[PDB]
Design a protein around this ligand. Structure first.
Ligand SMILES: *Sc1ccccc1O
Length: 67
């Protein structure tokens, strides 16, 4: 990857972690935002708005880091 091509591979692996987890609370909020985030990347193009969705992936990533 380089920019966008690498983005899709980042969240895709991000799911294998949650899907393997369990319990409510922090896992709940991270779930709804997890999938909705992906579909947002499909609508995106090459640049511009790609910066916004990028921040959406940065929030859920750092989140699971603690839980
Ligand atoms: S990131 C993630 C976790 C669990 C289910 C779906 C997802 O996209």
């Amino acid at each position: 990857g380089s920019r966008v091509k690498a983005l899709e591979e980042k969240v895709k692996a991000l799911e294998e972690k949650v899907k393997a987890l369990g319990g409510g609370g922090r896992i709940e909020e991270l779930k709804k935002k997890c999938e909705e985030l992906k579909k947002k990347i499909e609508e995106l193009g090459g640049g511009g708005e790609v910066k916004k969705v990028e921040e959406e992936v940065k929030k859920l990533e750092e989140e699971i880091k603690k839980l």
